[PDB]
Amino acid sequence: NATTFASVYAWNRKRISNCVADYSVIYNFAPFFAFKCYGVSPTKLNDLC
Amino acid sequence: FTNVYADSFVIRGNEVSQIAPGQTGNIADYNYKLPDDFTGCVIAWNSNK
């Protein structure tokens, strides 16, 4: 949640340093449309580093 | 066959594809869960009128 982001031609590829986060911060947005994920199933993106 | 179970309900058009197994949607959330084998079938039609 921020101001109006850039278009697809400009990528804000962000390096996230050492920190501690969970899915509660992600969960703040109900209008999630594309919830499809690969690699790890979305029910277990917690308690693994 | 052995025994058939028919279940009828009313959902929206964007929720029709959410009845597919092995995925999560508005219907495949905590509202409804369905077994991954699914020997049965899903048939849906318009009821606009």
Binding site: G39, V40, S41, T43, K44, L48 | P21, G22, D36
Partner: protein
């Protein structure tokens, strides 16, 4: 173990079973070679007797 923490139980059975087959074929190649190697050992033991 990490595969179990990685993916859902419907999917990745296609990754489990190929690893099952590749290991049981290794067992098959091992015990076939063992039954081969026991044959001349038995013949040599009979000759020694």
């Amino acid at each position: 173990n990490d595969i179990l923490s990685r993916l859902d139980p419907p999917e990745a059975e296609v990754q489990i079973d190929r690893l099952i087959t590749g290991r049981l074929q290794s067992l098959q190649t091992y015990v076939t070679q063992q039954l081969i190697r026991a044959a001349e050992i038995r013949a040599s033991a009979n000759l020694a007797a």
